[PDB]
Amino acid sequence: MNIFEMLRIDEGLRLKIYKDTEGYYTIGIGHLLTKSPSLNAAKSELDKAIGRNTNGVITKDEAEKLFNQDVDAAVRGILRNAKLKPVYDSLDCVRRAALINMVFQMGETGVAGFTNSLRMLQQKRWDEAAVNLAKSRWYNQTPNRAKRVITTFRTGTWDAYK
Ligand SMILES: [Cl-]
Ligand SMILES: [Cl-]
């Protein structure tokens, strides 16, 4: 198991523009296109992202390409973030994957706001962090996925993904 497989499980793969859990236009492996309500705006952003007239449909290869770029960008945002970096550097590889997943879902900004949980993870107080992470809109809106990531931080293993 690794970050790619983990997120492929959490996000699925769709080759036609779709709406995510928040109702935003997305495609591929959880690649958000736009928060705008306009399908055209979405098709526009899609073509711009792919470099061709897609007509709202992409290939598997294209999806995987966006995906790789998105993972990369998540890691890179973490490393450039003063609040996140130290946490990330303090964690083992499995838990780093949990932090990346959250950043991929919610953006660096979103995650950097879980101050208390972050401090707990930094301190390696796993059970406490898990309880704190659960008191969040994130958990209440996407409880099954949140549970998986939370179990990952709590245990340091991939059991939730097996
Ligand atoms: Cl892009
Ligand atoms: Cl969920």
Side-chain angles (χ1 to χ4, degrees), residues 66-96:
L66 294 177
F67 181 48
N68 192 303
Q69 288 173 174
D70 291 340
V71 173
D72 212 42
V75 181
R76 287 182 292 81
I78 280 170
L79 304 173
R80 295 198 258 83
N81 184 298
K83 286 90 157 297
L84 301 176
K85 184 173 192 294
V87 182
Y88 184 85
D89 283 351
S90 74
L91 293 170
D92 58 279
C93 70
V94 181
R95 293 175 169 100
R96 281 173 188 181

PDB file of all heavy atoms in Angstrom, residues 66-96:
ATOM      1  N   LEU A  66      -3.175  13.714 -14.120  1.00  0.00           N
ATOM      2  CA  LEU A  66      -3.640  14.738 -13.195  1.00  0.00           C
ATOM      3  C   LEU A  66      -3.400  14.290 -11.771  1.00  0.00           C
ATOM      4  O   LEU A  66      -3.075  15.117 -10.904  1.00  0.00           O
ATOM      5  CB  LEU A  66      -5.147  15.002 -13.282  1.00  0.00           C
ATOM      6  CG  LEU A  66      -5.549  15.607 -14.609  1.00  0.00           C
ATOM      7  CD1 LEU A  66      -7.053  15.766 -14.621  1.00  0.00           C
ATOM      8  CD2 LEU A  66      -4.918  16.983 -14.767  1.00  0.00           C
ATOM      9  N   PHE A  67      -3.648  13.014 -11.530  1.00  0.00           N
ATOM     10  CA  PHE A  67      -3.490  12.473 -10.202  1.00  0.00           C
ATOM     11  C   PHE A  67      -2.084  12.603  -9.706  1.00  0.00           C
ATOM     12  O   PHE A  67      -1.841  13.036  -8.566  1.00  0.00           O
ATOM     13  CB  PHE A  67      -3.987  11.027 -10.166  1.00  0.00           C
ATOM     14  CG  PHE A  67      -3.899  10.312  -8.806  1.00  0.00           C
ATOM     15  CD1 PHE A  67      -4.356  10.927  -7.634  1.00  0.00           C
ATOM     16  CD2 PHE A  67      -3.461   8.981  -8.737  1.00  0.00           C
ATOM     17  CE1 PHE A  67      -4.371  10.227  -6.425  1.00  0.00           C
ATOM     18  CE2 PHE A  67      -3.460   8.267  -7.538  1.00  0.00           C
ATOM     19  CZ  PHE A  67      -3.920   8.904  -6.384  1.00  0.00           C
ATOM     20  N   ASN A  68      -1.131  12.197 -10.527  1.00  0.00           N
ATOM     21  CA  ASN A  68       0.241  12.308 -10.084  1.00  0.00           C
ATOM     22  C   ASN A  68       0.616  13.766  -9.765  1.00  0.00           C
ATOM     23  O   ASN A  68       1.308  14.106  -8.784  1.00  0.00           O
ATOM     24  CB  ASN A  68       1.179  11.721 -11.157  1.00  0.00           C
ATOM     25  CG  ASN A  68       2.629  11.500 -10.728  1.00  0.00           C
ATOM     26  OD1 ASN A  68       3.371  12.429 -10.282  1.00  0.00           O
ATOM     27  ND2 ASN A  68       3.047  10.250 -10.941  1.00  0.00           N
ATOM     28  N   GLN A  69       0.152  14.673 -10.581  1.00  0.00           N
ATOM     29  CA  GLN A  69       0.470  16.076 -10.353  1.00  0.00           C
ATOM     30  C   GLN A  69      -0.123  16.567  -9.080  1.00  0.00           C
ATOM     31  O   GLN A  69       0.487  17.346  -8.348  1.00  0.00           O
ATOM     32  CB  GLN A  69      -0.178  16.945 -11.472  1.00  0.00           C
ATOM     33  CG  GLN A  69       0.595  16.706 -12.767  1.00  0.00           C
ATOM     34  CD  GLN A  69      -0.036  17.375 -13.957  1.00  0.00           C
ATOM     35  OE1 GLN A  69       0.557  17.353 -15.053  1.00  0.00           O
ATOM     36  NE2 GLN A  69      -1.215  17.979 -13.784  1.00  0.00           N
ATOM     37  N   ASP A  70      -1.368  16.141  -8.827  1.00  0.00           N
ATOM     38  CA  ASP A  70      -2.055  16.517  -7.606  1.00  0.00           C
ATOM     39  C   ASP A  70      -1.373  15.970  -6.343  1.00  0.00           C
ATOM     40  O   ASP A  70      -1.321  16.660  -5.370  1.00  0.00           O
ATOM     41  CB  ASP A  70      -3.540  16.114  -7.589  1.00  0.00           C
ATOM     42  CG  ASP A  70      -4.340  16.933  -8.592  1.00  0.00           C
ATOM     43  OD1 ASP A  70      -3.982  18.003  -9.051  1.00  0.00           O
ATOM     44  OD2 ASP A  70      -5.424  16.368  -8.935  1.00  0.00           O
ATOM     45  N   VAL A  71      -0.860  14.725  -6.362  1.00  0.00           N
ATOM     46  CA  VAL A  71      -0.153  14.186  -5.214  1.00  0.00           C
ATOM     47  C   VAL A  71       1.074  14.990  -4.962  1.00  0.00           C
ATOM     48  O   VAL A  71       1.376  15.445  -3.839  1.00  0.00           O
ATOM     49  CB  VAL A  71       0.139  12.713  -5.418  1.00  0.00           C
ATOM     50  CG1 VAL A  71       1.013  12.203  -4.291  1.00  0.00           C
ATOM     51  CG2 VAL A  71      -1.193  11.940  -5.429  1.00  0.00           C
ATOM     52  N   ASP A  72       1.796  15.211  -6.036  1.00  0.00           N
ATOM     53  CA  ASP A  72       2.994  16.007  -5.950  1.00  0.00           C
ATOM     54  C   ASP A  72       2.753  17.382  -5.338  1.00  0.00           C
ATOM     55  O   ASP A  72       3.433  17.853  -4.424  1.00  0.00           O
ATOM     56  CB  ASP A  72       3.542  16.071  -7.369  1.00  0.00           C
ATOM     57  CG  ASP A  72       5.016  16.144  -7.366  1.00  0.00           C
ATOM     58  OD1 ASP A  72       5.546  15.346  -6.489  1.00  0.00           O
ATOM     59  OD2 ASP A  72       5.630  16.961  -8.008  1.00  0.00           O
ATOM     60  N   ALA A  73       1.753  18.068  -5.845  1.00  0.00           N
ATOM     61  CA  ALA A  73       1.400  19.368  -5.339  1.00  0.00           C
ATOM     62  C   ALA A  73       1.036  19.302  -3.847  1.00  0.00           C
ATOM     63  O   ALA A  73       1.329  20.217  -3.030  1.00  0.00           O
ATOM     64  CB  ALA A  73       0.211  19.940  -6.139  1.00  0.00           C
ATOM     65  N   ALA A  74       0.355  18.229  -3.441  1.00  0.00           N
ATOM     66  CA  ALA A  74      -0.019  18.122  -2.012  1.00  0.00           C
ATOM     67  C   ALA A  74       1.240  18.030  -1.137  1.00  0.00           C
ATOM     68  O   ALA A  74       1.342  18.722  -0.140  1.00  0.00           O
ATOM     69  CB  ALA A  74      -0.954  16.938  -1.702  1.00  0.00           C
ATOM     70  N   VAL A  75       2.176  17.163  -1.528  1.00  0.00           N
ATOM     71  CA  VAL A  75       3.389  17.013  -0.754  1.00  0.00           C
ATOM     72  C   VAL A  75       4.133  18.316  -0.680  1.00  0.00           C
ATOM     73  O   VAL A  75       4.600  18.743   0.383  1.00  0.00           O
ATOM     74  CB  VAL A  75       4.285  15.957  -1.380  1.00  0.00           C
ATOM     75  CG1 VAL A  75       5.535  15.854  -0.477  1.00  0.00           C
ATOM     76  CG2 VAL A  75       3.504  14.624  -1.281  1.00  0.00           C
ATOM     77  N   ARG A  76       4.220  18.920  -1.866  1.00  0.00           N
ATOM     78  CA  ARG A  76       4.929  20.162  -1.975  1.00  0.00           C
ATOM     79  C   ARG A  76       4.241  21.261  -1.157  1.00  0.00           C
ATOM     80  O   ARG A  76       4.887  22.049  -0.477  1.00  0.00           O
ATOM     81  CB  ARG A  76       5.415  20.467  -3.429  1.00  0.00           C
ATOM     82  CG  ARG A  76       6.619  19.578  -3.859  1.00  0.00           C
ATOM     83  CD  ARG A  76       7.209  19.838  -5.272  1.00  0.00           C
ATOM     84  NE  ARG A  76       6.302  19.476  -6.382  1.00  0.00           N
ATOM     85  CZ  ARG A  76       5.272  20.243  -6.855  1.00  0.00           C
ATOM     86  NH1 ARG A  76       4.966  21.450  -6.356  1.00  0.00           N
ATOM     87  NH2 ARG A  76       4.494  19.801  -7.847  1.00  0.00           N
ATOM     88  N   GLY A  77       2.921  21.256  -1.073  1.00  0.00           N
ATOM     89  CA  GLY A  77       2.268  22.279  -0.236  1.00  0.00           C
ATOM     90  C   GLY A  77       2.578  22.057   1.239  1.00  0.00           C
ATOM     91  O   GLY A  77       2.707  22.959   2.035  1.00  0.00           O
ATOM     92  N   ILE A  78       2.605  20.814   1.623  1.00  0.00           N
ATOM     93  CA  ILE A  78       2.930  20.456   2.980  1.00  0.00           C
ATOM     94  C   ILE A  78       4.324  20.947   3.344  1.00  0.00           C
ATOM     95  O   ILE A  78       4.544  21.560   4.410  1.00  0.00           O
ATOM     96  CB  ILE A  78       2.889  18.933   3.159  1.00  0.00           C
ATOM     97  CG1 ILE A  78       1.446  18.435   3.323  1.00  0.00           C
ATOM     98  CG2 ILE A  78       3.694  18.542   4.406  1.00  0.00           C
ATOM     99  CD1 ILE A  78       1.365  16.883   3.254  1.00  0.00           C
ATOM    100  N   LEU A  79       5.293  20.663   2.458  1.00  0.00           N
ATOM    101  CA  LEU A  79       6.664  21.060   2.732  1.00  0.00           C
ATOM    102  C   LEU A  79       6.875  22.524   2.733  1.00  0.00           C
ATOM    103  O   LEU A  79       7.858  22.966   3.261  1.00  0.00           O
ATOM    104  CB  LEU A  79       7.648  20.462   1.752  1.00  0.00           C
ATOM    105  CG  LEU A  79       7.525  18.962   1.739  1.00  0.00           C
ATOM    106  CD1 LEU A  79       8.387  18.425   0.630  1.00  0.00           C
ATOM    107  CD2 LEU A  79       8.078  18.442   3.052  1.00  0.00           C
ATOM    108  N   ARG A  80       5.991  23.277   2.082  1.00  0.00           N
ATOM    109  CA  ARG A  80       6.156  24.714   2.057  1.00  0.00           C
ATOM    110  C   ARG A  80       5.341  25.372   3.168  1.00  0.00           C
ATOM    111  O   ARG A  80       5.408  26.574   3.350  1.00  0.00           O
ATOM    112  CB  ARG A  80       5.656  25.296   0.724  1.00  0.00           C
ATOM    113  CG  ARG A  80       6.421  24.884  -0.534  1.00  0.00           C
ATOM    114  CD  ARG A  80       6.136  25.834  -1.710  1.00  0.00           C
ATOM    115  NE  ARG A  80       5.192  25.341  -2.737  1.00  0.00           N
ATOM    116  CZ  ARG A  80       3.818  25.374  -2.741  1.00  0.00           C
ATOM    117  NH1 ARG A  80       3.029  25.882  -1.756  1.00  0.00           N
ATOM    118  NH2 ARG A  80       3.205  24.864  -3.809  1.00  0.00           N
ATOM    119  N   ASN A  81       4.525  24.594   3.893  1.00  0.00           N
ATOM    120  CA  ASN A  81       3.672  25.161   4.914  1.00  0.00           C
ATOM    121  C   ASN A  81       4.308  25.138   6.303  1.00  0.00           C
ATOM    122  O   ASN A  81       4.697  24.089   6.835  1.00  0.00           O
ATOM    123  CB  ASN A  81       2.299  24.499   4.840  1.00  0.00           C
ATOM    124  CG  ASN A  81       1.366  25.157   5.827  1.00  0.00           C
ATOM    125  OD1 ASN A  81       1.598  25.119   7.007  1.00  0.00           O
ATOM    126  ND2 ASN A  81       0.330  25.804   5.368  1.00  0.00           N
ATOM    127  N   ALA A  82       4.471  26.313   6.899  1.00  0.00           N
ATOM    128  CA  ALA A  82       5.134  26.378   8.206  1.00  0.00           C
ATOM    129  C   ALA A  82       4.463  25.581   9.317  1.00  0.00           C
ATOM    130  O   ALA A  82       5.083  25.127  10.295  1.00  0.00           O
ATOM    131  CB  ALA A  82       5.382  27.813   8.620  1.00  0.00           C
ATOM    132  N   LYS A  83       3.164  25.404   9.212  1.00  0.00           N
ATOM    133  CA  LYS A  83       2.477  24.626  10.217  1.00  0.00           C
ATOM    134  C   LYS A  83       2.499  23.151   9.920  1.00  0.00           C
ATOM    135  O   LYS A  83       2.402  22.329  10.805  1.00  0.00           O
ATOM    136  CB  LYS A  83       1.017  24.972  10.262  1.00  0.00           C
ATOM    137  CG  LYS A  83       0.807  26.303  10.911  1.00  0.00           C
ATOM    138  CD  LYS A  83       0.841  27.386   9.847  1.00  0.00           C
ATOM    139  CE  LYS A  83       0.107  28.663  10.251  1.00  0.00           C
ATOM    140  NZ  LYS A  83      -1.345  28.476  10.483  1.00  0.00           N
ATOM    141  N   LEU A  84       2.567  22.813   8.664  1.00  0.00           N
ATOM    142  CA  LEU A  84       2.484  21.396   8.353  1.00  0.00           C
ATOM    143  C   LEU A  84       3.790  20.667   8.309  1.00  0.00           C
ATOM    144  O   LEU A  84       3.916  19.490   8.661  1.00  0.00           O
ATOM    145  CB  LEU A  84       1.729  21.205   7.016  1.00  0.00           C
ATOM    146  CG  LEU A  84       0.310  21.760   6.999  1.00  0.00           C
ATOM    147  CD1 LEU A  84      -0.336  21.617   5.599  1.00  0.00           C
ATOM    148  CD2 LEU A  84      -0.552  21.114   8.053  1.00  0.00           C
ATOM    149  N   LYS A  85       4.759  21.325   7.770  1.00  0.00           N
ATOM    150  CA  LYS A  85       6.032  20.689   7.613  1.00  0.00           C
ATOM    151  C   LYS A  85       6.597  19.977   8.830  1.00  0.00           C
ATOM    152  O   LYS A  85       7.066  18.858   8.815  1.00  0.00           O
ATOM    153  CB  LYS A  85       6.990  21.715   7.006  1.00  0.00           C
ATOM    154  CG  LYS A  85       8.308  21.042   6.739  1.00  0.00           C
ATOM    155  CD  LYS A  85       9.314  21.901   5.966  1.00  0.00           C
ATOM    156  CE  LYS A  85      10.501  21.084   5.480  1.00  0.00           C
ATOM    157  NZ  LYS A  85      11.327  20.580   6.570  1.00  0.00           N
ATOM    158  N   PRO A  86       6.581  20.661   9.964  1.00  0.00           N
ATOM    159  CA  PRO A  86       7.137  20.089  11.157  1.00  0.00           C
ATOM    160  C   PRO A  86       6.376  18.877  11.558  1.00  0.00           C
ATOM    161  O   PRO A  86       6.935  17.904  12.057  1.00  0.00           O
ATOM    162  CB  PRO A  86       7.004  21.138  12.258  1.00  0.00           C
ATOM    163  CG  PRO A  86       6.344  22.342  11.604  1.00  0.00           C
ATOM    164  CD  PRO A  86       6.028  22.003  10.160  1.00  0.00           C
ATOM    165  N   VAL A  87       5.081  18.900  11.308  1.00  0.00           N
ATOM    166  CA  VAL A  87       4.323  17.697  11.682  1.00  0.00           C
ATOM    167  C   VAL A  87       4.709  16.518  10.825  1.00  0.00           C
ATOM    168  O   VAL A  87       4.979  15.417  11.265  1.00  0.00           O
ATOM    169  CB  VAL A  87       2.813  17.967  11.599  1.00  0.00           C
ATOM    170  CG1 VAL A  87       2.036  16.716  12.042  1.00  0.00           C
ATOM    171  CG2 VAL A  87       2.491  19.186  12.482  1.00  0.00           C
ATOM    172  N   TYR A  88       4.720  16.806   9.562  1.00  0.00           N
ATOM    173  CA  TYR A  88       5.033  15.810   8.573  1.00  0.00           C
ATOM    174  C   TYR A  88       6.390  15.231   8.821  1.00  0.00           C
ATOM    175  O   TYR A  88       6.585  14.021   8.815  1.00  0.00           O
ATOM    176  CB  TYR A  88       5.001  16.540   7.211  1.00  0.00           C
ATOM    177  CG  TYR A  88       5.217  15.620   6.027  1.00  0.00           C
ATOM    178  CD1 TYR A  88       4.136  14.936   5.476  1.00  0.00           C
ATOM    179  CD2 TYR A  88       6.492  15.526   5.461  1.00  0.00           C
ATOM    180  CE1 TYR A  88       4.343  14.152   4.344  1.00  0.00           C
ATOM    181  CE2 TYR A  88       6.718  14.719   4.356  1.00  0.00           C
ATOM    182  CZ  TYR A  88       5.623  14.058   3.796  1.00  0.00           C
ATOM    183  OH  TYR A  88       5.819  13.292   2.685  1.00  0.00           O
ATOM    184  N   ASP A  89       7.355  16.099   9.051  1.00  0.00           N
ATOM    185  CA  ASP A  89       8.725  15.582   9.281  1.00  0.00           C
ATOM    186  C   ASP A  89       8.795  14.751  10.523  1.00  0.00           C
ATOM    187  O   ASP A  89       9.629  13.858  10.626  1.00  0.00           O
ATOM    188  CB  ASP A  89       9.664  16.747   9.512  1.00  0.00           C
ATOM    189  CG  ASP A  89      10.016  17.423   8.224  1.00  0.00           C
ATOM    190  OD1 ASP A  89       9.620  16.779   7.141  1.00  0.00           O
ATOM    191  OD2 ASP A  89      10.625  18.440   8.212  1.00  0.00           O
ATOM    192  N   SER A  90       7.902  14.998  11.471  1.00  0.00           N
ATOM    193  CA  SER A  90       7.978  14.178  12.664  1.00  0.00           C
ATOM    194  C   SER A  90       7.355  12.822  12.554  1.00  0.00           C
ATOM    195  O   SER A  90       7.534  11.977  13.444  1.00  0.00           O
ATOM    196  CB  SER A  90       7.335  14.861  13.841  1.00  0.00           C
ATOM    197  OG  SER A  90       5.905  14.844  13.709  1.00  0.00           O
ATOM    198  N   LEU A  91       6.582  12.566  11.493  1.00  0.00           N
ATOM    199  CA  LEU A  91       5.854  11.308  11.418  1.00  0.00           C
ATOM    200  C   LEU A  91       6.566  10.207  10.690  1.00  0.00           C
ATOM    201  O   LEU A  91       7.430  10.494   9.856  1.00  0.00           O
ATOM    202  CB  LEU A  91       4.540  11.561  10.613  1.00  0.00           C
ATOM    203  CG  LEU A  91       3.523  12.504  11.349  1.00  0.00           C
ATOM    204  CD1 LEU A  91       2.388  12.891  10.379  1.00  0.00           C
ATOM    205  CD2 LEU A  91       2.885  11.758  12.527  1.00  0.00           C
ATOM    206  N   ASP A  92       6.132   8.964  10.953  1.00  0.00           N
ATOM    207  CA  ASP A  92       6.559   7.781  10.213  1.00  0.00           C
ATOM    208  C   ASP A  92       5.897   7.784   8.828  1.00  0.00           C
ATOM    209  O   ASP A  92       4.999   8.556   8.582  1.00  0.00           O
ATOM    210  CB  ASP A  92       6.151   6.481  10.871  1.00  0.00           C
ATOM    211  CG  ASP A  92       4.675   6.371  11.070  1.00  0.00           C
ATOM    212  OD1 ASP A  92       4.293   7.026  12.151  1.00  0.00           O
ATOM    213  OD2 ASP A  92       3.915   5.847  10.259  1.00  0.00           O
ATOM    214  N   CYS A  93       6.352   6.942   7.905  1.00  0.00           N
ATOM    215  CA  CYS A  93       5.826   7.014   6.562  1.00  0.00           C
ATOM    216  C   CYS A  93       4.347   6.718   6.403  1.00  0.00           C
ATOM    217  O   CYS A  93       3.714   7.334   5.521  1.00  0.00           O
ATOM    218  CB  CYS A  93       6.689   6.379   5.407  1.00  0.00           C
ATOM    219  SG  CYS A  93       6.648   4.599   5.630  1.00  0.00           S
ATOM    220  N   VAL A  94       3.801   5.807   7.212  1.00  0.00           N
ATOM    221  CA  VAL A  94       2.394   5.501   7.062  1.00  0.00           C
ATOM    222  C   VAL A  94       1.580   6.687   7.481  1.00  0.00           C
ATOM    223  O   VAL A  94       0.647   7.112   6.809  1.00  0.00           O
ATOM    224  CB  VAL A  94       2.012   4.278   7.864  1.00  0.00           C
ATOM    225  CG1 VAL A  94       0.530   3.948   7.673  1.00  0.00           C
ATOM    226  CG2 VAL A  94       2.831   3.128   7.351  1.00  0.00           C
ATOM    227  N   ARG A  95       1.967   7.280   8.579  1.00  0.00           N
ATOM    228  CA  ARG A  95       1.167   8.420   9.010  1.00  0.00           C
ATOM    229  C   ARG A  95       1.349   9.595   8.125  1.00  0.00           C
ATOM    230  O   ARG A  95       0.467  10.397   8.002  1.00  0.00           O
ATOM    231  CB  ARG A  95       1.439   8.785  10.448  1.00  0.00           C
ATOM    232  CG  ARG A  95       0.960   7.692  11.377  1.00  0.00           C
ATOM    233  CD  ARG A  95       1.353   8.027  12.826  1.00  0.00           C
ATOM    234  NE  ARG A  95       0.702   7.163  13.805  1.00  0.00           N
ATOM    235  CZ  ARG A  95       1.297   6.105  14.379  1.00  0.00           C
ATOM    236  NH1 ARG A  95       2.539   5.761  14.067  1.00  0.00           N
ATOM    237  NH2 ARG A  95       0.607   5.342  15.276  1.00  0.00           N
ATOM    238  N   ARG A  96       2.486   9.742   7.488  1.00  0.00           N
ATOM    239  CA  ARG A  96       2.661  10.860   6.548  1.00  0.00           C
ATOM    240  C   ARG A  96       1.649  10.747   5.420  1.00  0.00           C
ATOM    241  O   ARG A  96       1.136  11.766   4.936  1.00  0.00           O
ATOM    242  CB  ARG A  96       4.044  10.869   5.916  1.00  0.00           C
ATOM    243  CG  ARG A  96       5.111  11.452   6.828  1.00  0.00           C
ATOM    244  CD  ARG A  96       6.537  11.306   6.272  1.00  0.00           C
ATOM    245  NE  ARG A  96       7.492  11.711   7.307  1.00  0.00           N
ATOM    246  CZ  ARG A  96       8.795  11.719   7.127  1.00  0.00           C
ATOM    247  NH1 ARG A  96       9.294  11.376   5.970  1.00  0.00           N
ATOM    248  NH2 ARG A  96       9.598  12.120   8.119  1.00  0.00           N
TER     249      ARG A  96
END
